[PDB]
Design a protein around this motif. Structure first.
Motif, PDB file in Angstrom:
ATOM      1  N   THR A  38       7.015 -13.919  -1.650  1.00 47.87           N
ATOM      2  CA  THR A  38       6.508 -12.660  -1.132  1.00 47.87           C
ATOM      3  C   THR A  38       6.749 -11.609  -2.205  1.00 47.87           C
ATOM      4  OG1 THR A  38       6.684 -13.082   1.262  1.00 47.87           O
ATOM      5  CG2 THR A  38       6.947 -10.801   0.547  1.00 47.87           C
ATOM      6  N   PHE A  39       5.692 -10.898  -2.588  1.00 46.87           N
ATOM      7  CA  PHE A  39       5.823  -9.788  -3.527  1.00 46.87           C
ATOM      8  C   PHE A  39       5.682  -8.486  -2.758  1.00 46.87           C
ATOM      9  CE2 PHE A  39       4.057 -13.497  -5.620  1.00 46.87           C
ATOM     10  CZ  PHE A  39       4.914 -13.676  -6.704  1.00 46.87           C
ATOM     11  N   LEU A  40       6.733  -7.677  -2.802  1.00 47.81           N
ATOM     12  CA  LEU A  40       6.799  -6.441  -2.037  1.00 47.81           C
ATOM     13  C   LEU A  40       6.700  -5.246  -2.979  1.00 47.81           C
ATOM     14  CD1 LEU A  40       7.499  -5.754   1.119  1.00 47.81           C
ATOM     15  CD2 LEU A  40       9.720  -5.143   0.171  1.00 47.81           C
ATOM     16  N   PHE A  41       5.886  -4.263  -2.600  1.00 48.99           N
ATOM     17  CA  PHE A  41       5.696  -3.058  -3.398  1.00 48.99           C
ATOM     18  C   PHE A  41       6.343  -1.889  -2.675  1.00 48.99           C
ATOM     19  CE2 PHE A  41       2.490  -4.551  -6.525  1.00 48.99           C
ATOM     20  CZ  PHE A  41       2.207  -5.799  -5.973  1.00 48.99           C
ATOM     21  N   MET A  42       7.219  -1.167  -3.370  1.00 54.32           N
ATOM     22  CA  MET A  42       7.962  -0.061  -2.763  1.00 54.32           C
ATOM     23  C   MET A  42       8.092   1.123  -3.721  1.00 54.32           C
ATOM     24  SD  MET A  42      11.583  -0.346  -0.662  1.00 54.32           S
ATOM     25  CE  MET A  42      12.652  -0.239  -2.095  1.00 54.32           C
ATOM     26  N   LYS A  43       7.863   2.326  -3.201  1.00 50.94           N
ATOM     27  CA  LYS A  43       7.983   3.545  -3.984  1.00 50.94           C
ATOM     28  C   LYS A  43       8.615   4.625  -3.124  1.00 50.94           C
ATOM     29  CE  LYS A  43       5.436   6.305  -7.383  1.00 50.94           C
ATOM     30  NZ  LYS A  43       4.095   6.608  -7.964  1.00 50.94           N
ATOM     31  N   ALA A  79      15.669   3.554  -9.436  1.00 55.18           N
ATOM     32  CA  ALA A  79      14.208   3.602  -9.401  1.00 55.18           C
ATOM     33  C   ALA A  79      13.716   4.786  -8.572  1.00 55.18           C
ATOM     34  CB  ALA A  79      13.647   2.296  -8.861  1.00 55.18           C
ATOM     35  N   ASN A  80      14.344   5.005  -7.417  1.00 56.99           N
ATOM     36  CA  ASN A  80      13.979   6.116  -6.537  1.00 56.99           C
ATOM     37  C   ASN A  80      14.184   7.486  -7.182  1.00 56.99           C
ATOM     38  OD1 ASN A  80      13.105   4.344  -4.572  1.00 56.99           O
ATOM     39  ND2 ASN A  80      14.873   4.629  -3.214  1.00 56.99           N
ATOM     40  N   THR A  81      15.278   7.631  -7.929  1.00 61.63           N
ATOM     41  CA  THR A  81      15.567   8.860  -8.680  1.00 61.63           C
ATOM     42  C   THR A  81      14.494   9.119  -9.747  1.00 61.63           C
ATOM     43  OG1 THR A  81      17.953   8.576  -8.310  1.00 61.63           O
ATOM     44  CG2 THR A  81      17.301  10.090 -10.072  1.00 61.63           C
ATOM     45  N   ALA A  82      14.107   8.058 -10.452  1.00 58.15           N
ATOM     46  CA  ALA A  82      13.065   8.117 -11.476  1.00 58.15           C
ATOM     47  C   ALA A  82      11.648   8.121 -10.883  1.00 58.15           C
ATOM     48  CB  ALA A  82      13.231   6.961 -12.455  1.00 58.15           C
ATOM     49  N   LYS A  83      11.564   8.028  -9.554  1.00 62.45           N
ATOM     50  CA  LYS A  83      10.293   8.008  -8.808  1.00 62.45           C
ATOM     51  C   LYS A  83       9.322   6.912  -9.267  1.00 62.45           C
ATOM     52  CE  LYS A  83      10.490  13.028  -7.903  1.00 62.45           C
ATOM     53  NZ  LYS A  83      11.347  12.941  -6.683  1.00 62.45           N
ATOM     54  N   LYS A  84       9.851   5.746  -9.620  1.00 61.61           N
ATOM     55  CA  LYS A  84       8.973   4.673 -10.084  1.00 61.61           C
ATOM     56  C   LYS A  84       8.754   3.533  -9.097  1.00 61.61           C
ATOM     57  CE  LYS A  84      12.502   3.377 -13.502  1.00 61.61           C
ATOM     58  NZ  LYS A  84      12.738   2.637 -14.774  1.00 61.61           N
ATOM     59  N   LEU A  85       7.595   2.894  -9.227  1.00 59.90           N
ATOM     60  CA  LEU A  85       7.241   1.748  -8.411  1.00 59.90           C
ATOM     61  C   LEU A  85       8.245   0.618  -8.606  1.00 59.90           C
ATOM     62  CD1 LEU A  85       4.984   0.291  -6.602  1.00 59.90           C
ATOM     63  CD2 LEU A  85       4.079  -0.505  -8.795  1.00 59.90           C
ATOM     64  N   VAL A  86       8.636  -0.002  -7.498  1.00 52.05           N
ATOM     65  CA  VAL A  86       9.442  -1.218  -7.530  1.00 52.05           C
ATOM     66  C   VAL A  86       8.608  -2.354  -6.952  1.00 52.05           C
ATOM     67  CG1 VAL A  86      11.624  -2.316  -6.900  1.00 52.05           C
ATOM     68  CG2 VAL A  86      11.527   0.169  -7.166  1.00 52.05           C
ATOM     69  N   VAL A  87       8.512  -3.444  -7.710  1.00 48.04           N
ATOM     70  CA  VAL A  87       7.862  -4.664  -7.244  1.00 48.04           C
ATOM     71  C   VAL A  87       8.934  -5.743  -7.167  1.00 48.04           C
ATOM     72  CG1 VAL A  87       5.954  -6.304  -7.567  1.00 48.04           C
ATOM     73  CG2 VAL A  87       5.744  -3.942  -8.422  1.00 48.04           C
ATOM     74  N   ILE A  88       9.098  -6.319  -5.980  1.00 51.82           N
ATOM     75  CA  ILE A  88      10.145  -7.310  -5.743  1.00 51.82           C
ATOM     76  C   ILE A  88       9.540  -8.676  -5.437  1.00 51.82           C
ATOM     77  CG2 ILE A  88      12.246  -7.865  -4.451  1.00 51.82           C
ATOM     78  CD1 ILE A  88      11.446  -4.571  -3.576  1.00 51.82           C
ATOM     79  N   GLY A  91      11.202   4.712  -1.180  1.00 52.25           N
ATOM     80  CA  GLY A  91      11.642   4.311   0.156  1.00 52.25           C
ATOM     81  C   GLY A  91      10.577   3.720   1.060  1.00 52.25           C
ATOM     82  N   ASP A  92       9.315   3.829   0.646  1.00 50.54           N
ATOM     83  CA  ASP A  92       8.188   3.371   1.455  1.00 50.54           C
ATOM     84  C   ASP A  92       7.557   2.105   0.888  1.00 50.54           C
ATOM     85  OD1 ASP A  92       8.431   5.692   3.130  1.00 50.54           O
ATOM     86  OD2 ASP A  92       7.257   6.835   1.669  1.00 50.54           O
ATOM     87  N   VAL A  93       7.316   1.131   1.762  1.00 50.67           N
ATOM     88  CA  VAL A  93       6.578  -0.077   1.400  1.00 50.67           C
ATOM     89  C   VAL A  93       5.107   0.292   1.201  1.00 50.67           C
ATOM     90  CG1 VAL A  93       5.861  -2.402   2.115  1.00 50.67           C
ATOM     91  CG2 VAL A  93       8.184  -1.599   2.620  1.00 50.67           C
ATOM     92  N   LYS A  94       4.573  -0.062   0.036  1.00 51.55           N
ATOM     93  CA  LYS A  94       3.202   0.292  -0.333  1.00 51.55           C
ATOM     94  C   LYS A  94       2.228  -0.870  -0.181  1.00 51.55           C
ATOM     95  CE  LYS A  94       4.293   4.496  -1.404  1.00 51.55           C
ATOM     96  NZ  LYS A  94       3.988   5.545  -0.400  1.00 51.55           N
ATOM     97  N   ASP A  95       2.737  -2.095  -0.310  1.00 49.50           N
ATOM     98  CA  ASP A  95       1.896  -3.289  -0.262  1.00 49.50           C
ATOM     99  C   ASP A  95       2.742  -4.558  -0.195  1.00 49.50           C
ATOM    100  OD1 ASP A  95      -0.589  -4.729  -0.363  1.00 49.50           O
ATOM    101  OD2 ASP A  95      -1.365  -3.210  -1.742  1.00 49.50           O
ATOM    102  N   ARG A  96       2.093  -5.678   0.127  1.00 48.69           N
ATOM    103  CA  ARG A  96       2.734  -6.994   0.133  1.00 48.69           C
ATOM    104  C   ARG A  96       1.715  -8.063  -0.255  1.00 48.69           C
ATOM    105  NH1 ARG A  96       7.347  -9.103   3.896  1.00 48.69           N
ATOM    106  NH2 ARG A  96       7.349  -6.913   4.584  1.00 48.69           N
ATOM    107  N   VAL A  97       2.151  -9.012  -1.083  1.00 48.98           N
ATOM    108  CA  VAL A  97       1.347 -10.182  -1.443  1.00 48.98           C
ATOM    109  C   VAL A  97       2.145 -11.415  -1.035  1.00 48.98           C
ATOM    110  CG1 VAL A  97       0.411 -11.563  -3.361  1.00 48.98           C
ATOM    111  CG2 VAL A  97       0.155  -9.071  -3.373  1.00 48.98           C
ATOM    112  N   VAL A  98       1.528 -12.286  -0.245  1.00 50.88           N
ATOM    113  CA  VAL A  98       2.205 -13.474   0.272  1.00 50.88           C
ATOM    114  C   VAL A  98       1.548 -14.735  -0.283  1.00 50.88           C
ATOM    115  CG1 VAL A  98       2.936 -14.731   2.343  1.00 50.88           C
ATOM    116  CG2 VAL A  98       2.845 -12.242   2.393  1.00 50.88           C
ATOM    117  N   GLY A  99       2.341 -15.551  -0.973  1.00 52.28           N
ATOM    118  CA  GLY A  99       1.863 -16.803  -1.548  1.00 52.28           C
ATOM    119  C   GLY A  99       1.600 -16.694  -3.035  1.00 52.28           C
ATOM    120  N   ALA A 100       1.208 -17.814  -3.635  1.00 54.11           N
ATOM    121  CA  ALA A 100       0.935 -17.871  -5.062  1.00 54.11           C
ATOM    122  C   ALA A 100      -0.493 -17.421  -5.376  1.00 54.11           C
ATOM    123  CB  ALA A 100       1.197 -19.281  -5.598  1.00 54.11           C
ATOM    124  N   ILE A 101      -0.793 -16.158  -5.076  1.00 53.46           N
ATOM    125  CA  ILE A 101      -2.130 -15.615  -5.331  1.00 53.46           C
ATOM    126  C   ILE A 101      -2.108 -14.730  -6.573  1.00 53.46           C
ATOM    127  CG2 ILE A 101      -4.210 -14.637  -4.300  1.00 53.46           C
ATOM    128  CD1 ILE A 101      -2.679 -14.739  -1.564  1.00 53.46           C
TER     129      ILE A 101
END
Length: 111
Positions: A79-84, A19-28, A86-96
């Motif tokens: 927990t939904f984590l947003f990463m691009k 994902a990092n090589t392709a420079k794409k957003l990762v949502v975990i 190597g850097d964390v871009k955002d986080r969503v906690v809970g069933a929202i």
């Protein structure tokens, strides 16, 4: 596009580096089998993965891959984590559902 379940540190490493090589957003999605809200969010997360094929959607079981959960200080689920790149871009906690949807739309677009 499909949600990729990551079951080992090797798999984690491979998904993140590709994902990092392709420079794409990762949502975990950090999840647990016993966690009720996680079951609720599973279809929502899978739907978003189909809608945003330019981003990589990963599923991580916090009991299966403890070092990865610990790395990001994940003690609340889901927990939904947003990463691009190597850097964390955002986080969503809970069933929202609305917040997760909005943040995927925000981060998956051209920057």
């Amino acid at each position: 596009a499909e949600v990729i379940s990551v079951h080992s540190l090797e798999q984690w490493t491979m998904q993140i580096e590709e994902a990092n090589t392709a420079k794409k957003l990762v949502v975990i999605d950090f999840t647990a089998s016993w966690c009720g809200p996680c079951r609720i969010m599973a279809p929502v997360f899978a739907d978003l993965a189909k809608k945003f094929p330019n981003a990589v959607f990963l599923k991580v079981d916090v009991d299966e891959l403890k070092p990865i959960a610990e790395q990001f200080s994940v003690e609340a689920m889901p927990t939904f984590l947003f990463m691009k790149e190597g850097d964390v871009k955002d986080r969503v906690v809970g069933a929202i559902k609305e917040e997760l949807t909005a943040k995927v739309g925000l981060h998956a677009a051209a920057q």
